[PDB]
Amino acid sequence: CLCVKTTSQVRPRHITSLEVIKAGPHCPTAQLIATLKNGRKICLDLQALLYKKIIKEHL
Amino acid sequence: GDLQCLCVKTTSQVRPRHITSLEVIKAGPHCPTAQLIATLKNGRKICLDLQALLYKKIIKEHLES
Amino acid sequence: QCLCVKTTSQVRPRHITSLEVIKAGPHCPTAQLIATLKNGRKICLDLQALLYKKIIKEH
């Protein structure tokens, strides 16, 4: 599995591309790999991002 | 710029069970439109039709009864 | 922070469609070699072990 730790500390203006790799034998969860402007790739915590996007708006 | 749009053809028929990865490449200097590149199990890479999928996944399923 | 967790040398070069080198940085102190496989899965490569294997094969 490529992604071990996931962050929700990301600005959508910092992301140039997002790749979803579906779960498989080698890795049980989908991986959300965001490529940032600088070329760094990080793994996203989608639930945490959706939660923040819900809280920010009080829904 | 140095780069162009990766996608020449867009496909509107794909079963998610064929797709092993999906890469959303945002519009930019390289391409004025966002691109969705699906990698399938057989290894073939295709581009998915973004408007058609937005229709299916959002308009038809959440705004249409 | 670091995309690659464990590195492998168990890969056939023609299983690989792309290879990305991400230089070391503040978020990840080591350079990373990420191979994208035909199926779309990403793995991290141990370059040293790969070269070693490729010289053993030829002695």
Add this chain to the structure above:
Amino acid sequence: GDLQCLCVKTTSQVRPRHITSLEVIKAGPHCPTAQLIATLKNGRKICLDLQALLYKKIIKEHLES
């Protein structure tokens, strides 16, 4: 085919200290040649001349005296 070559231009002038990542995209249905994509600190993506890079890094430095 469904995809094409990402690189329209290749650049032969780059200071490696500007490069934060390098991607080699192997030749395939999408492109008859391998492409080398450099991402720089500022976020600019350029394509490197892989032929010149191979010349320099293999021919000039290991086959030429």
